[PDB]
Design a binder for this molecule. Structure first.
Ligand SMILES: [Fe+3]
Ligand SMILES: [Fe+3]
Ligand SMILES: [Fe+3]
Ligand SMILES: [Fe+3]
Lengths: 296, 296
């Protein structure tokens, strides 16, 4: 009578070792190859070359940078330690499970990148105040808890919708700032780190959205309509909360209207990643060219 | 809109973003820097340069290689998708959670490496027969299910003991083969992939064992003694099972007695990583210096 006798007697199916010679879904391999081939660490970027432009930035630009980046750090902390991990049990293939372990790790690299930037450019008090602000900001905590409510739940598809909206939508109110600043010769090296992060997030959102589409198409007619309604309802809720967050971050700078257009643009892309039409007419998504141009 | 209100009302404390500017345990940063600094993918090693060496190996040598490598793949599949992940909820620090995400990913890289080796060296039937054998071998399935039984349990410390014994002891009836072959100038590029895996495992066992010690030392002397008994008891069971696994894989080649000494050498290392004295007398753990050097 060993402690594990019941577990063993109860799990008669053989535990399987992953076999990469047999791939049920080629997309898993394509994504594994793309993500691992794109491996990077923030130390590879010379952020210290940004010290002069940081000191040149206005008090308002530095405050917005600290806050936005702390908000992004929080989402990556969540996605790396809870989000991506929550998708493993519902994977269609073993190679998909492997891909999620890479996503989890890279989210931790993304989160750490912001501390590398902070430690290189900012003062300790600025850093401490930013993290304190992130704990007290009601909109940031609300988007974080709404997302974590699904990861902690028991519905596999909801976890993929939440994850895709987090990856293809929730980060953008934050990616706007370094793309703007870099088009004005400010934080150009920091912007190279943000571009490496975007290179990963675009793939993450595309992939998890793809898996959601495969899973939801396995359902009954009524159920597929229910998940579509759930997705648009969650998107509206997150968008409404994001408008508030955006106003509070950028109103002083006066960039708010352009950032809101950027929000609508990315919300449409998030929904498209999940297989749905956009929520906003295309004419409401006209972010300035300088921004989509800095993204390039 | 309403679906997450309850969760939000029950999680009033702020969700925290990881801050790498404040490290409550220096070891977490040391290990993160070491593991990430040691990033590698199997594609970096020219395994195809081992084809002549592989083709000269006997059918018995090839079969043992296919089986030990598939058993190692099974262990890494479990560790990356279930093991490291099970340690997240019990972390003492947020930086420790980040480290586990890197460990999860690298275990997936390890598992994939054996497929890279098989896909380069072995025939399709050989690969299919190896995975089939892995599903049917009672000792392999038993060690996997014993370890998984603790990952699936609710005792955090038992998860770490299981993980450390998996990493510091179980992987070893397996690394003996490539290191010995390497000392006979056979499969030398494959051995380079094995050394990259060992460089990681070494750190994983050390780190998780270190966290196990920190946690058990918070208990009474009486509870500490019960965990020590549990640890030795689990080692007796895994050792007994491993002896049989070793005899079946190695008897044909005639390497069994030396692999058993190697099992005892590693069982002592695994117990040491958990803070305990070794189980076997030093004189019962002799390992050839030609193996020990590639082990390094
Ligand atoms: Fe990220
Ligand atoms: Fe991501
Ligand atoms: Fe491993
Ligand atoms: Fe390991």
């Amino acid at each position: 009578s060993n402690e594990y006798d019941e577990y063993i007697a109860n799990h008669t199916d053989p535990v399987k070792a992953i076999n990469w010679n047999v791939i049920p879904d080629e997309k898993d391999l394509e994504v594994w190859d793309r993500l691992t081939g794109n491996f990077w660490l923030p130390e590879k970027i010379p952020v210290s070359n940004d010290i002069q432009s940081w000191n040149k930035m206005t008090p308002q630009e530095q405050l917005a940078t600290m806050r936005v980046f702390t908000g992004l750090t929080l989402l990556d902390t969540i996605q790396g330690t809870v989000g991506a991990i929550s998708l493993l049990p519902d994977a269609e293939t073993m190679h998909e499970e492997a891909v999620y372990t890479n996503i989890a790790f890279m989210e931790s690299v993304h989160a750490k990148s912001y501390s590398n930037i902070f430690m290189t450019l900012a003062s300790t008090p600025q850093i401490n105040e930013a993290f304190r602000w992130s704990e007290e900001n009601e909109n940031l905590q609300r988007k974080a808890k709404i997302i974590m409510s699904y990861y902690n739940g028991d519905d596999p598809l909801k976890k993929k919708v939440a994850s895709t909206l987090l990856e293809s939508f929730l980060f953008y109110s934050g990616f706007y700032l370094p793309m703007y600043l870099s088009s004005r010769a400010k934080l150009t090296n920091t912007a190279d780190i943000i571009r490496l992060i975007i290179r990963d997030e675009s793939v993450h959102g595309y992939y998890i959205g793809y898996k959601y589409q495969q899973g939801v198409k396995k359902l009954s007619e009524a159920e597929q309509e229910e998940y579509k309604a759930y997705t648009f309802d969650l998107m509206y809720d997150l968008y409404e909360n994001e408008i508030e967050y955006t106003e509070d971050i950028y109103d002083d700078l006066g960039w708010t209207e352009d950032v809101k257009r950027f929000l609508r643009y990315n919300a449409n892309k998030a929904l498209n990643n999940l297989g749905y039409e956009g929520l906003f007419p295309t004419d409401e998504t006209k972010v300035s060219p300088a921004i989509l141009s800095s993204l390039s």
